[PDB]
Amino acid sequence: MKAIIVKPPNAGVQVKDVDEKKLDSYGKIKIRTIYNGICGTDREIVNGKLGKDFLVLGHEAIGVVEESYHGFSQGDLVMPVNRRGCGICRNCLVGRPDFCETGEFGEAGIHKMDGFMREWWYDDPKYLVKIPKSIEDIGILAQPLADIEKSIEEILEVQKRVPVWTCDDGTLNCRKVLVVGTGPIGVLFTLLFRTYGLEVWMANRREPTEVEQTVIEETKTNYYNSSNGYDKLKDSVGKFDVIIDATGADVNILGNVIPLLGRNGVLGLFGFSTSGSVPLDYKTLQEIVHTNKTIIGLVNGQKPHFQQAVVHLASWKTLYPKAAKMLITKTVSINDEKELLKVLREKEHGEIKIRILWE
Amino acid sequence: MKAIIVKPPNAGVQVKDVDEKKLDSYGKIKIRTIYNGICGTDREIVNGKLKGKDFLVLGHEAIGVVEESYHGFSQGDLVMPVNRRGCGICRNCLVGRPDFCETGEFGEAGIHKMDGFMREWWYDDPKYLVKIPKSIEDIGILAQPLADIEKSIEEILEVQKRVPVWTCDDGTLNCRKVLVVGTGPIGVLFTLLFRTYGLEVWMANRREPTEVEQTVIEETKTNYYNSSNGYDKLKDSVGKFDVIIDATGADVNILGNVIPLLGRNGVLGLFGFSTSGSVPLDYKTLQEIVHTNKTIIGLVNGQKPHFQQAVVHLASWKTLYPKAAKMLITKTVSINDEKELLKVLREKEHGEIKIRILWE
Amino acid sequence: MKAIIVKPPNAGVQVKDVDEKKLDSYGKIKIRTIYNGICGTDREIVNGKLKGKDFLVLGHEAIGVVEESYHGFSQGDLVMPVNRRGCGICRNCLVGRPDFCETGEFGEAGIHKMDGFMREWWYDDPKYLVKIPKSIEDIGILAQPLADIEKSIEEILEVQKRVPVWTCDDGTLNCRKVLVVGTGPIGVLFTLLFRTYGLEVWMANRREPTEVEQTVIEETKTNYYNSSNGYDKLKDSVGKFDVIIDATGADVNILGNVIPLLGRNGVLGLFGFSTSGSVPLDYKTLQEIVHTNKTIIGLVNGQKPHFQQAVVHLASWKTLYPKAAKMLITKTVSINDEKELLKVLREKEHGEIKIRILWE
């Protein structure tokens, strides 16, 4: 069987025929892969930056069901939930390894579990999300979107501690969000916050790309060029109710944006920072205390969030047709090894989502 | 100005030109009506089945176009007014939530205290206006009915947070089953939104499915039960439900029939406004409700956040359920086609989901 | 071993020595009974009003002393067993919460599947044991009944989070009024806990107050209503309630009487297990429930966190309401005083709150 394989914690990837008999199987439903998606976590594994001799790569997949089994029909498109329970703690037991208390959960194509960049795989109905044909084109995005659905869901649940966090009209329309970092995570955060009616500011250290500009216009989102800092934003707009870190960046970005957090506000840590150290002085922290501010680490969506992601992706073909068309950067054939290896090892400038097609 | 008007104790409806000076104005934004919708409350008022003013403008379902760029609203934007507005006194109303008004002294447009929206144009306050994207103009009139249901289901899920774990093995609610009694617009919209949330649905009506219901069945993967001879056969083959919605305008004895089909920790959602009957509640039924943590909840009125959720869900349905979505508007009537207009105002058509009025 | 035993379809109760080998053991901790409490469920079983085993040990209310230092439990500690234990299958039971058991296949000690606690000693699992401080030994038997009520009120407040603002101008619930129908231990404990939370309370019984009720009235600042002639006079003078608790074991027609006294957004808490009657629910009553967001909720069973809250609240009452607290134990009977013991098991005394059994 053709698979895309890695041999961790060593760097490198191959695109090759492997023994289907040594690959991990997860239940009785056979699924023939049609698309994979590639993200930074995939790049990391390829560049060694993170029984079996190899691991199958990939945690973003849509496949087709080959024969009807119980809930699922032949020809149904499905997406597997990539994070799976440790089998021990109460969070995993209730289907919620995003809150696993042992850290011993499985991750498809990362840890303890062959991924899904392979011709086909066997999975269990309980881990499969139905992907309506009507969103087949952008449906691969339900996986990453799922983390963000979980994040926004959580940030809203936490904000229930504030007696009234709604506006005069009963909505969250008057709440402002600063999303730092564009890239597929910042873009998805923006789209989903806009869907919920909040006002959003996107910030990058540069002017917008064409995708971002289309996002601005179509969703009525604001953009702030943050190359010389945040002072002008705070002077022009004042403070934000929610701030999302969506950069894989130097934690010092947190020093820059923390002073833009408003009363009762939330700083959502979602990006996985790779460099730096950020000083917090006593005046900063005492202010956090005085104004009921919260900082929260945001991670991993589970099945309910994949299903939310599907409904939202569906709404975005209606509401935001032009942005939705720009979500998929390009599709690369599983058969074009040179171009595949290239996209696998490296992100192109301003990439949203690279897709793998198995044909 | 052209207006559809009623003279509220009395039966009667007229489509005539009326003195604009006399019509309630609610703010600074001028909006030219393009669509109204009609519901059973309109019919009821039209047949007299329900203050210095001679007449009342009918109608609480409206889309209009913003005449002149105002603050946040562009010349040309479609908007929908929130029909229930606060009593100005209680804490729920002051936070934008008269659906939970504590005085009961709230305003209802086209119904009580408030001229409605079946008139050429009106003035409003932005805080009462929901933006309707052009990409959902065709079925967007449905955001007003759907708002009540978004609120009812949001509430049902908030209430069920009393159960330590009401989610399923996979972390979802896909294993929860909803029985929806009553088809037609409320029943149909409950089904679609519960399916959208991923729950299993049975619609039930004392008859075989209409064309629209059959379409939803097939497109949404929904189950149907002919309840003409009661519920014994549904109980025996499917068992009990986690949620039951009364969406019938029916006789309250309906509850005596569906209550035995309520499962452990389940919710009976009373949404329909019953207009006849008395239902006996035996001590064994009642002490079973006690032993099994059952809840009966009266469900009423969506507000602005729910209109906005309705908008997002109508938009998802155009993609996800394209055949059912395009069948939610039964037909459009011109304001200038008087004979037909008068007929749709007076009575409902068999299998009608929504009749829309277009202003030309 | 000395044990109070019953032979569950049948009426009859005996206090005799029984084969220890035959009694259900639940874990590794040995506990010597010092107190039992008696409630109406015991009486019911004793009068036959409700598996390789000949007899069942009665009683679900117990304090014992830890015989031998175990893990977390010191030789000499008082403990109380949680009486309802999970079915081992469903998600609610697996998180320690069989009060919301989805199979209904839970165990109940001294009642069904499970030998009770009216026996000299038993073995248990620490996860089922609540620590009873010595400073509340006198009234600590009450933590078992109070646990059901802590759970019912916790639930009522969780449910009322559906209302955007259910707090008062001062940010509290002091302006919310509770009607408690039924006095005696459940009604009395509901009153005390709702007062503890700061809400206004009216107790109601079809008679003038007993000595104990009068004491609570005065000490807790609670209101009383003689309901002998219905509720019209309470409605006319006080108006409507935000919460009404049925704590009567009564006839379900009681609900037909108190339902008109439920206010907007209010909750009818069904806690009492009614054993006769059929109550008619008219369409106007039902559509009013709809328009005003009313909720009817079946209230059942406290679990461990609620026993522990009960413990904290019993302790607060010794300070805050010292006269009422010392009247919650009506009297203590010796296990060795058989004639009297048999009488308290068979029937309740007028105005009894709690009869305690002491093991000597």
Add this chain to the structure above:
Amino acid sequence: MKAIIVKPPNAGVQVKDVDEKKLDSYGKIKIRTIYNGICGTDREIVNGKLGKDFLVLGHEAIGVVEESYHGFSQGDLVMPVNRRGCGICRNCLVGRPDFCETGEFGEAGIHKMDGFMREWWYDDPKYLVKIPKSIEDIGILAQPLADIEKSIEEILEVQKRVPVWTCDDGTLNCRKVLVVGTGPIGVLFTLLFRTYGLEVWMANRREPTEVEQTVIEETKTNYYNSSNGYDKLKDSVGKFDVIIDATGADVNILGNVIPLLGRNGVLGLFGFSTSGSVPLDYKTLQEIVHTNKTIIGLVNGQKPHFQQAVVHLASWKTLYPKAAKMLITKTVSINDEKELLKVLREKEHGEIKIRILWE
């Protein structure tokens, strides 16, 4: 009228007769003060560290109602809520200026509002908490305890984001709390967490005082001497589900205790740090992200929390009689000016609560 007055932002305090006619009045109920309490905020104002020529000091008070008015009877003991709404935002409007969005709320004896160290004052029923005579002796503590009730209430509400944060028995008994800093805030946090059934560790850079030792024994609380750091605690006990900063300290304490925070855990910032700067490296922050950790600033209890505080103080006379007796360090006469001025300007070693008696 005798009052204890300050002339902000200048340092200094006087104990003297003032013109009752220039003092702030808040409603129609007249209250003759009996006790005040003194805390660090009072010390700060006295040492200038933070129409009218002076402000009456003090936000901790119990008084007696002089005549029956509406709800309140002659002889009823009452405590005023010290923080009061800005009159503009929705949080204040619902009685919750702990979440005020303008920052323009009033604070008795600090800001915009004469305090309560004065012979008597006029207040509004809506701001008054009933103090049962049965807890008159320790009842002054309801004010500070109120902030902590609000804090624990909030930390628990936030933890509802975790699908199951309860233990196998349905309780929070298996959850561990680290309370850093003893002193009245750390002590009250400890007592209240123990009341809720959680296991608690108190930490100071020294061995326990007599009060603390009585707290340990009577509540079955643990103590860790943290003078040489937290490594031995983490080695012996492992990680904590909740960590409370109750020190007025150098923010660097946060660097020391953050690595003791466990999965899904909460760091509650309650103390107002006065010195220092704390570096957060990328490995620390990325870990926060991976494990759904939250940091939250904790501030101010309102009327419902004062009423909770009363019920708990009442339970603690039953449950923890010896600790409860040690809560009041000493009572000082309003008439002993030298000793009053002394306690007003400075905290004595290991002080829990100094009381002022008006006789």
